[PDB]
């Protein structure tokens, strides 16, 4: 019974991911997000343990679910005649990182450092669990404004992580790497690092660097805001044109710009409260 376990609230958003409603779990008043995905729009399917056929997004969410709060938690799911319904946790109060950057403009590097670090830990967790998100962007990052904790959301473009080449992609093009633009080929980790460089530029400059294919492949990073030389170096390294020239996640988190990160609670008290 789906309509009896959850009280449904207003629409939160709709788009390529489906339609997402605010909700509350009746048993304990837990805030949830209720995501509807039409069966005809699901590209990749998977099988659970019991071999029940579910969208791959359900498989990936189950693989990353745990106590670690940096990724969205799938609480339950249901199958309907023409759709699947996913019950996801909902931070409250919350703002996504796209709206946050729109309202605040370019972020102080201390705050960008804290946010970027948490995103790296969340993406490391995905990869540790065998999951490639493929749509890292500010729109897909929720800020818990009380706790200062970030959550990676919308695994609808994701895939099982593999070490061979990917030749399909349905994430966000302005965060996709030049090898995808040029050759329709990418490898998972180095493509994720590219999207992280786009994200870090977005945080410290107030918008993404590239809008057009020619800029993505062009190899020039112009800084529209004052950014420290250390931060610029890390961004330009993540945005190396050759995938093998990009840093690993270890090299990103050992980068000099990344040291002395704020704790999440400190981040909320200094920058969010």
């Amino acid at each position: 019974p789906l309509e009896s376990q959850y009280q449904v609230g207003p629409l939160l958003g709709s788009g390529g991911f489906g339609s997402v409603y605010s909700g509350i779990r009746v048993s304990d008043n837990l805030p949830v997000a209720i995501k509807h995905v039409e069966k005809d729009r699901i590209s990749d399917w998977g099988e659970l343990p019991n071999g029940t056929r579910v969208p791959m997004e359900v498989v990936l969410l189950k693989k990353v679910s745990s106590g670690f709060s940096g990724v969205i938690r799938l609480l339950d799911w249901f199958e309907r005649p023409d759709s699947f319904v996913l019950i996801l946790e909902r931070p409250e109060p919350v703002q996504d990182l796209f709206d946050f950057i729109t309202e605040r403009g370019a972020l102080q590097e201390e705050l960008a450092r804290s946010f970027f670090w948490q995103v790296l830990e969340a993406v490391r967790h995905c990869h540790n669990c065998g999951v490639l998100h493929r749509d890292i962007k500010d729109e897909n990052i929720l800020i818990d404004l009380n706790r200062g904790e970030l959550k990676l959301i919308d695994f609808g473009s994701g895939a099982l992580l593999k070490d061979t080449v990917y030749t399909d992609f349905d994430g966000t093009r302005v965060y996709s790497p030049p090898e995808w633009i040029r050759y329709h080929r990418y490898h998972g980790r180095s493509a994720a690092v590219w999207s992280l460089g786009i994200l870090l530029y977005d945080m410290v400059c107030g918008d993404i660097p590239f809008e057009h294919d020619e800029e993505i492949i062009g190899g020039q990073v112009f800084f529209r805001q004052r950014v420290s030389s250390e931060c610029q170096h890390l961004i330009r390294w993540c945005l190396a044109l050759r995938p093998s020239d990009r840093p690993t996640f270890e090299e990103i988190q050992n980068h000099p710009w990344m040291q002395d990160v704020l704790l999440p609670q400190e981040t909320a008290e200094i920058h969010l409260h």
Binding site: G15, G16, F17, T102, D135, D154, G156, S157, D170, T172
Partner: peptide, 9 residues
């Protein structure tokens, strides 16, 4: 200049 969201796909 115009900052905007970008849909997936």
């Amino acid at each position: 200049r115009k900052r905007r969201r970008h849909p997936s796909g």
